[PDB]
Amino acid sequence: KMAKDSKAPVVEIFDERDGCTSAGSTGKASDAGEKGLLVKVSMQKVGYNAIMAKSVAASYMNK
Amino acid sequence: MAKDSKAPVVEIFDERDGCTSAGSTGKASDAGEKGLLVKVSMQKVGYNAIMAKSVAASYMNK
Amino acid sequence: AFSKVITSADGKAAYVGGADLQALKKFVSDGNKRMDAVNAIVSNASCIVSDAVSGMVCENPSLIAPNGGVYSNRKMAACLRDAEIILRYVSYSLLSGDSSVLEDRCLNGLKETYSSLGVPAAGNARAVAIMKATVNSFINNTAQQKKLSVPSGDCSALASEAGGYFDKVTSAIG
Amino acid sequence: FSKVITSADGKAAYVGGADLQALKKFVSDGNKRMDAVNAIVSNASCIVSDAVSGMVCENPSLIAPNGGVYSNRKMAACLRDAEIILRYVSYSLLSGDSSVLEDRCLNGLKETYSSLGVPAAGNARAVAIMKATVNSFINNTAQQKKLSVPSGDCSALASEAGGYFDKVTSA
Ligand SMILES: *CCC1=C(C)C(=O)N/C1=C\c1[nH]c(/C=C2\N=C(C[C@H]3NC(=O)C([C@H](*)C)=C3C)C(C)=C2CCC(=O)O)c(CCC(=O)O)c1C
Ligand SMILES: *CCC1=C(C)C(=O)N/C1=C\c1[nH]c(/C=C2\N=C(C[C@H]3NC(=O)C([C@H](*)C)=C3C)C(C)=C2CCC(=O)O)c(CCC(=O)O)c1C
Ligand SMILES: *[C@@H](C)[C@H]1/C(=C/c2[nH]c(/C=C3N=C(/C=C4\NC(=O)C(CC)=C4C)C(C)=C\3CCC(=O)O)c(CCC(=O)O)c2C)NC(=O)[C@@H]1C
Ligand SMILES: *[C@@H](C)[C@H]1/C(=C/c2[nH]c(/C=C3N=C(/C=C4\NC(=O)C(CC)=C4C)C(C)=C\3CCC(=O)O)c(CCC(=O)O)c2C)NC(=O)[C@@H]1C
Ligand SMILES: *[C@@H](C)[C@H]1/C(=C/c2[nH]c(/C=C3N=C(/C=C4\NC(=O)C(CC)=C4C)C(C)=C\3CCC(=O)O)c(CCC(=O)O)c2C)NC(=O)[C@@H]1C
Ligand SMILES: *[C@@H](C)[C@H]1/C(=C/c2[nH]c(/C=C3N=C(/C=C4\NC(=O)C(CC)=C4C)C(C)=C\3CCC(=O)O)c(CCC(=O)O)c2C)NC(=O)[C@@H]1C
Ligand SMILES: *[C@H](C)[C@H]1/C(=C/c2[nH]c(/C=C3N=C(/C=C4\NC(=O)C(CC)=C4C)C(C)=C\3CCC(=O)O)c(CCC(=O)O)c2C)NC(=O)[C@@H]1C
Ligand SMILES: CCC1=C(C)/C(=C/C2=NC(=C\c3[nH]c(/C=C4\NC(=O)[C@H](C)[C@H]4CC)c(C)c3CCC(=O)O)/C(CCC(=O)O)=C2C)NC1=O
């Protein structure tokens, strides 16, 4: 049966081939043959977003 | 000026509808101001590659 | 590598680069285009979810009235949460090239969960349909405001595949 | 707040209850001011993106090769700065004065930008667009995104926020 923990796979795609470098750009995986490229996946709880909930309630009638 | 790229992050809380979470208690007294809180912290403003790429590709579209 | 972090569900990330990434993109179909298609979803996640739930409500304001599916901030927030959960399981299906995790961890028993809470199926199906349409445009880079810069070519097989994952959600909601 | 502003270490100050009653008592329009601040900060990403995008669409020389925001690196730095500035303006509106904005954000910023070659006209226009967008959000007159608050007149707070942007423009 489905999980009940509100967790979902958060996929992040990294393409830093333009050269712009930050601390996280180095050391998270080997880069051989794929310089500047990385896929990251983690399981994270999807948290409630009060600001967005309030915004939709007030704004939904505007495309 | 500072040189740490940090700015005051102000958050406004209004939970008077009664919807609470773990963070809704214990951070301050609520006497006389149920459901209401101002939070301020200094945080580095980080570079946002997704937004930078989006603006470069999309700026001509209002 | 990804199956392990999904099964542990403990928050630690898997990072795929280098030789592992080269192999991943040869194992899935249309591997480089698939990376771009996934980015088209996840980098727009907040836009996709907000617009879909907003459209669900604008087409049926009874949903926000008392007794409605998203009446009160609490219920609207739970609905925006679910839309993002669903979208993210779809995104992982597109990364991995199959729907097993979506079907097993997200959808199995979901109709009964929603039935017993009175989460309305018509509005739910519509939110999913709007996400499906929005994702299709982003994958094809045909959205009207936000654009993605990628090498020119065709991604219609990937777009169809993403649509099929949304159809599995629709068929789970009933 | 002064303690957390000076420590600048990420520890938060939480103001509720009697402390919040006192905060509001000593500034004008205390409750409306909380709403006006929320109108800025809850829209921060919208405000920054739209302002930098408009700066470029009106002046694409800024994104030509070697231009002010050409390359993702430079665009990202500019979006960062727009948010930094916006957030110091938001804190000025919360606290009722511009001392921290002027001292921690603006003092020496003109020379910093001039020596990096960051264009003054582009900076001015990004600030002007943020000023206009903030004015609409405070007054709840934006076209798409709305804020639900008790009906009334926030003209004074809107003018005060505009004055803080004017301090940025002067710098
Ligand atoms: C984040 C929003 C966005 C940006 C930015 C962008 O460039 N495209 C975006 C979204 C997008 N939306 C659709 C399709 C639909 N959106 C809605 C909801 C809104 N329509 C309303 O009537 C309404 C309340 C007044 C809304 C809120 C709907 C209904 C659709 C159509 C769904 C369908 O059945 O086809 C798309 C896809 C089409 C396109 O490219 O414009 C996109 C990309
Ligand atoms: C997140 C964006 C947003 C939502 C959602 C919403 O409901 N309102 C929003 C933004 C907003 N923008 C303005 C004012 C301006 N924005 C621009 C930039 C765009 N104009 C372009 O020509 C362009 C490139 C093609 C853009 C990007 C500009 C120039 C302005 C006007 C600034 C001025 O000199 O007055 C506002 C305020 C006006 C209004 O209420 O509509 C808002 C709320
Ligand atoms: C219900 C599910 C709604 C929702 C709530 C929600 N709140 C938070 C976080 C915070 N809420 C407060 C408010 C207070 N804390 C107090 O101690 C007091 C009394 C003085 C109040 C009024 C605060 C300060 C936070 C931040 C907590 C922190 O800084 O650590 C969240 C986020 C998760 C959390 O519990 O921290 C959520 C989800 N959100 C919604 O969308 C529903 C409408
Ligand atoms: C330059 C300032 C541009 C920019 C960069 C930026 N990147 C990140 C975060 C990450 N980048 C990667 C990429 C890799 N890590 C690796 O080890 C490899 C080789 C295999 C790559 C390609 C990753 C994984 C991250 C996230 C790290 C994590 O999950 O902890 C950031 C965020 C801050 C940071 O340094 O982590 C930034 C700022 N951003 C921009 O806007 C500029 C265009
Ligand atoms: C549909 C999705 C859109 C489209 C896609 C498209 N992409 C390519 C080529 C490449 N895309 C990448 C991207 C990545 N590879 C990675 O490993 C990562 C990080 C995880 C990313 C973001 C790459 C590397 C290529 C190869 C070429 C290059 O290096 O630039 C194509 C070209 C055809 C192909 O199969 O290679 C296409 C068509 N293009 C569109 O127009 C659609 C809107
Ligand atoms: C311009 C900003 C918009 C506007 C504002 C407006 N607000 C009120 C009344 C109140 N607003 C609050 C909100 C808070 N107080 C807090 O301490 C916090 C948390 C930090 C918040 C979010 C409160 C408590 C009130 C008092 C009324 C109530 O009990 O809800 C008014 C009414 C006049 C007044 O000064 O009270 C107005 C006009 N209204 C608009 O139409 C502008 C778009
Ligand atoms: C965007 C509207 C404009 C733009 C911005 C831009 N700024 C920089 C570099 C810096 N910006 C700052 C500003 C601050 N640092 C702080 O710590 C604070 C307060 C906490 C502020 C206000 C600083 C110090 C720098 C230099 C150091 C750094 O890079 O962070 C750049 C990079 C310039 C370069 O070529 O290296 C850019 C692009 N640029 C534009 O063209 C727009 C008009
Ligand atoms: C990780 C996988 C996972 C999924 C899929 C999941 C779904 C899920 N959605 C729920 C509730 C909910 N889901 C919604 C969603 C909506 N309401 C509407 O009207 C719209 C049609 C829709 C948004 C599009 C709402 C409002 C609730 C709360 C129902 C209530 O309390 O009455 C619940 C009941 C428990 C809870 O409130 O958290 C579950 C288990 N939980 C999980 O852990």
Author numbering:
A (entry chain A): 1 to 63
B (entry chain C): 2 to 63
C (entry chain B): 4 to 177
D (entry chain D): 5 to 175
Can you quote the paper on this entry?
In addition to their membrane‐bound chlorophyll a/c light‐harvesting antenna, the cryptophyte algae have evolved a unique phycobiliprotein antenna system located in the thylakoid lumen. The basic unit of this antenna consists of two copies of an αβ protomer where the α and β subunits scaffold different combinations of a limited number of linear tetrapyrrole chromophores. While the β subunit is highly conserved, encoded by a single plastid gene, the nuclear‐encoded α subunits have evolved diversified multigene families. By careful examination of three newly determined crystal structures in comparison with three previously obtained, we show how the α subunit amino acid sequences control chromophore conformations and hence spectral properties even when the chromophores are identical.
The crystal structure of PC577 from H. pacifica CCMP706 has been determined at 1.0 Å resolution. The atomic resolution electron density map shows unequivocally that PC577 has the same chromophores as PC612. The loop protecting the α20 PCB chromophore from the solvent is different in the two structures and it is marked by a distinct sequence in each protein (residues 21–27 following Cys20, which is the covalent chromophore attachment site). In PC577, this segment forms a single helical turn, making multiple hydrogen bonds to the α20 chromophore. Thus, the α20 PCB in PC577 is highly constrained by the protein. Thus, the differences in amino acid sequence between the α subunits of PC577 and PC612 are likely to be responsible for the observed spectral differences.
